[PDB]
DNA sequence: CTGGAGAATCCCGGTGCCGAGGCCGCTCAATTGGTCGTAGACAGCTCTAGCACCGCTTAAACGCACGTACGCGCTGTCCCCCGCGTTTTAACCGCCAAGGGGATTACTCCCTAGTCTCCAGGCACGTGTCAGATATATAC
DNA sequence: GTATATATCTGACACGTGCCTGGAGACTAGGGAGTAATCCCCTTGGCGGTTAAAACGCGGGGGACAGCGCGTACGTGCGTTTAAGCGGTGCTAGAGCTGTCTACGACCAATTGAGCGGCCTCGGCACCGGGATTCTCCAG
């Protein structure tokens, strides 16, 4: 298939599905490291890490929409680090 | 050596390039540059720091050692990131 | 004494007038709560409940399902211009993304 | 019908008990001491049915993954007349065996690991089975384990469990095994319990026979305990663990702090070796060849191998409960240049049997065997050796007894020596004490 | 040994008036309980403030009517006010 | 004499970024506010400081939107603001 | 009844607001676009400011009615009795 | 009866402890309110007040004028990262924009 | 007849004179400081109220205010403030 | 490249002014004291679920190489702002009038909270069958 | 002519059961609330005056924008190795409940001083009109 033919096919699949896209063990290990710096030896509910993963993946998907409109405004189809930075600046964060 | 066949990455690296590409595909991104994997990890880490710091402030106030689902839901609500489904 | 009738039955509503009154009295909103305040509020919450479930049930039907699931609810809220303004800052779990490619 | 060798008297006696149960309509569990040749007795039972009662219906043998090449060999050698087929493989290979072998009905015995069953329970459910024999039946001690249920579903005329260790933790477990066999005779756990009487309930359905009475010729085993003291790196680490101030962070950051939610585990990883804990090993280069022996008290005492390699060829085993420990022992052995072998639950099936055999050869160069108690401490047979060192102790005492019996079995003619590295004044002392308390209730009943 | 109140039975009684044939999942019913809790807290927060600004001790239906008019978008506000005033008239009879 | 295109634009930026005066003319804005109010209720009267509170809030909003709009045009490698730059800024803000 | 005063927001006054915002050069169509943006913002603030006055049963819009309307929309203003 | 000593004098504060307690009691924040709560809150309100007025006073002296005015307050809040994070959604009346041009727009 | 209106102005002045003795403040800058004190009072009191409801307590206390301050204020401001408030309660409880 | 001219704020010193600090008087909320009753700290107990090892299987990610979509530097292009001056209109300032309606206080009397008592909606509980989630054989 | 479409299990929903504690009855309590009426702050247009601001027109050079060519980087799929995911097993940290006992806060009445508004005025600094560099630009 040509460059970008499979890229559109993936966009359609993932937009239809409602599943979590990051792996669960690799993400749980990151939540627990960040926390140890605030307080030590905490334990965690199994549902609390899933609330963090849902909230994280919702935040990143929404930021990738604003990044793609800031890329198309500059007449490109490729997203770049500067487009993420303009989106985060206009949102005030 | 047998003592050392396995080697460990940092925990940020667990968010893999294949994992970020799917998120951008759900967001409707067609082509992506190489430097975005480093940039995206930096951005998620800042998001997790701000939510977790508060979820732990609530836990300490209640005098508990376990972080609950409600501690996470109240922290997201206080920042304008309301979440449905996990109670409250 | 006479046999009990629920205040929701008197108002002609399915949501609970009594629970709503207790919630308001114990939530520290005002030092007094009126008698019509719980009835007006229960009517509004049931109306808003019905508006979402009507759109969600249509989305379940177009998808050939009998059972409403979290995806059907997202589709309903995000395709309605007033519900998406009421709910512009909430995240629904296991709720997908409306399909759109530029 | 048996061909390769005659049976021992007890073994003949066993089949008589077994065949009475089929006639009786009862099922039961045979429980000779470990390594007394239960396998052969079962092969004979499946051949009685082909030769005398003429039932060739499909039967099932569930065996641990390690014993799959032994189970097969045994059937062929002693009773070549029965035909057998065995399942193991990836998804593709598994399907082909179903399509070209299992479904054509050209066989009378299926032998498969407990794992390949859960993976393909359906094809198994279709058939109707005559006998279901499960070797090593402690895998279904919990009433609710996934496998315990799937096993119960399949249709069956008669059932036999073979377990060396009837008792593992508490009576509820015994009820669980009794239910799968005689659901009618044991409707509920509560009933079995409370009513409790030793031997009276057990006699009809259980047959136990200890090696000492049946095989007098066997040399009796030696029990020894080596208490040890901690090295110095260990004394520091052990202390800092308890104090929760290990600090230690690879990526600078002022050393951060380690997370120690569960403390008993951390202290035990260090009582074995401080090298296990990251950053304790000195320096980026590593490769110091002698620091290992002296940095761990149990490894200092392991200099005993050198006397034994020269002290004739009394071969030794060094069992363990953690993979990393076994790693060290392998790099150390390489520095001394001894001859060694190692099994693990990570290793492929084909390799396992090869390494049981090179070592069991009559005149092999190999001297030490390193084997994880879970993966290799159940069901394999390794009789050439004569000494046992157990690097670590286990909570359940029966996990330990079994590893000790890999060597002591029929064919052993030299005393089996047992030696256990324990640390004298630490929580390791508690773990050992605890395993002993559980055995008291069992007491090796006759 | 501890009960947990929720709106779930009320959401189901309304569901069957709107769509007699359909059912609903447990995940979806948990989102529906969260919607009712969020909307309740919004309307009662504006009512309370309104009373304070005007120096009053009581929350009445007139404060809840104004809170609904401040919170809802225009087509929902006009219908929600019609449903509230119909209920209060019927209740008073 | 003549200064060059864009030189006086810089003096105007500096002069208006020093002062705190209101820039829109007051009386014209007062008529705009009142005209809008008739759509909601007839014969409203108004406090004089209520119109100044509306003007302060209105000029603060427009100045801040023009800053976000300028970033977008520089991002697109231009110096002139265009209608699509106001539309991008409002869309990314969530308006 | 007042006629259209949105043309009373002059081209010079919109340009001074763009200058305080740091804008060097401006396209001609910004002015029509800016007037609609201003009108939508004022319609949202005045609507709520009047809802408050009506609740209070007053005919005069007060500075506090405006300050409360802005406070709801996430636009706190200091200075007017807040 | 002994001579009165206002609670702010007992805690060593300039802001009013007594008024803060009334405001909390009558403001619908809780069923009850403790006696250490108005003391803690009055101390924080006075610290945050002194934090602003210190930098405002310096902006007034930098402009060579003796009275603080509303622009001086804007220059203080915006030039400090934490006060600008605390007051990030606030407009101050008669407050100018900090002086600033993007370097792309400056002459060669 | 004409009713009184309360404000923070006399405390704001007394704190200015402690910080910069010779300086003053115009009436418009006073209106802005009076607005600031009321905004920050309402933010702290709203968070302190909720935290008690979450944990099912009916009393607001210095501990709930301390947590409210750590949630609302930025990082360094929060540290100094927390010290000022715990100091004031230590002095007050020595003299109640 | 750069001297020169000539419009830009920029200091400087005088002139007037109603903003800000002072005080007065006296108003009405903070103070103290005593009392009441119940929020919440303490200790104890139970037992759910969180944390640490292994084992098992095979989706998944890893790196490799291939090749061409599209990133982005120069150029030419010729339109639409900028800035100037002019003329022009409507902003500002001040002055003075009528009367809408914010505000006060006063009066009276409907409203809701309190208490105790009571019995039916709603809680969790344990089954069951089906909606869906793929297995099972077809079918053309 | 092959991928649904036939075909087939199975945890999740939905039923009803038993159970128990918030909702509902029906009076007394005493304040908030409403409505009358009063006063006089502050609002609405009157005019004229006359500055400043907006408006118009149009010379001219800045930036917006299309196109070309160039070149390295992102996407593709291969085989490969990796460890997510799932079962099993051990254990006991610490959420949760109930129970008990006593420091605390709210309340009352009474009390007297910080803080309110009113009436005041000499000094901060807006404003005008004098000269100072010093921004920028252009024709030598
Ligand atoms: N009758 C016999 N004659 C000779 N060797 C025997 C006999 N019975 C058993 N053995 C050998 O002794 C060992 C018994 O061990 P195994 O069959 O694995 O019994 P278990 O299952 O009880 O461990 C086997 O290796 C087998 O080769
Ligand atoms: Mg065996």
Residue numbers in the entry:
A (entry chain A): 41 to 133
B (entry chain B): 15 to 102
C (entry chain G): 11 to 112
D (entry chain W): 174 to 369, 383 to 632
E (entry chain H): 28 to 120
F (entry chain E): 39 to 133
G (entry chain F): 21 to 102
H (entry chain C): 11 to 118
Text lifted from the article:
In one of the six components, we see rocking of SNF2h on the nucleosome, where both lobes of the SNF2h ATPase shift upwards away from SHL6 and towards the histone octamer core. In agreement with this hypothesis, closer inspection of the nucleotide state for each endpoint structure from this variability component shows that SNF2h bound to SHL6 has clear density for ADP-BeFx, whereas SNF2h dissociated from SHL6 does not, and only ADP is clearly visible. Dissociation of SNF2h from SHL6 leads to overall weaker density for SNF2h relative to SNF2h density when bound, which suggests that interactions with SHL6 help promote conformational stability for SNF2h on nucleosomes. Previous cryo-EM structures of ISW1, the yeast homolog of SNF2h, bound to nucleosome showed that the ADP-bound state has the top lobe of the ATPase domain dramatically shifted upwards but the bottom lobe similarly positioned away from SHL6 as in the current SHL6-dissociated structure. Since our SNF2h sample is prepared with ADP-BeFx, which mimics ATP in a pre-hydrolysis state or activated ATP state, our current structure with SNF2h dissociated from SHL6 likely represents an intermediate between the ATP-bound and post-hydrolysis ADP-bound states.
Here, to address this issue, we develop graphene-oxide-coated EM grids functionalized with either single-stranded DNA (ssDNA) or thiol-poly(acrylic acid-co-styrene) (TAASTY) co-polymer. These grids protect complexes between the chromatin remodeler SNF2h and nucleosomes from the AWI and facilitate collection of high-quality micrographs of intact SNF2h-nucleosome complexes in the absence of crosslinking. We chose to use SNF2h as a test case because SNF2h adopts both monomeric and dimeric states on a nucleosome, with the dimeric state being more active. We generated complexes by mixing 500 nM SNF2h and 100 nM nucleosomes with a 60-base pair DNA overhang on one end in the presence of 60 mM KCl and 2 mM ADP-BeFx and directly applied 3 µL to ssDNA GO and/or TAASTY GO grids. Using this method, we obtain high-quality single-particle cryo-EM datasets and determine high-resolution structures of the SNF2h-nucleosome complex.
